Amino acid sequence: KVGFFKRNRPPLEEDDEEGE
């Protein structure tokens, strides 16, 4: 889908999308 952003979710994820 929109990998775009789904590949770079803005902060407030403070973990590159809440990842490791």
3-state secondary structure 1-20: CCHHHHCCCCCCCCCCCCCC
| Contact indicator for 16, 6 with CB cutoff of 8 Å | no
* Distant-in-sequence, close-in-space partners of 17: CB < 8 Å, separation ≥ 6: 8, 9
How many other CB atoms are found less than 10 A from the CB of residue 17?
Answer: 13
Sign of the torsion formed by the C-alpha atoms of 16, 10, 2 and 4:
negative
Tell me the C-alpha distance between 1 and 6, whole Å: 8
Distance CA 9, CA 16 (A): 7
Phi, psi of 10 (to 5 degrees): -55, 165
Contact (Cβ atoms closer than 8 angstroms) between residue 9 and residue 17: yes
- Cα angle value 9/11/14 (rounded, 5°): 110
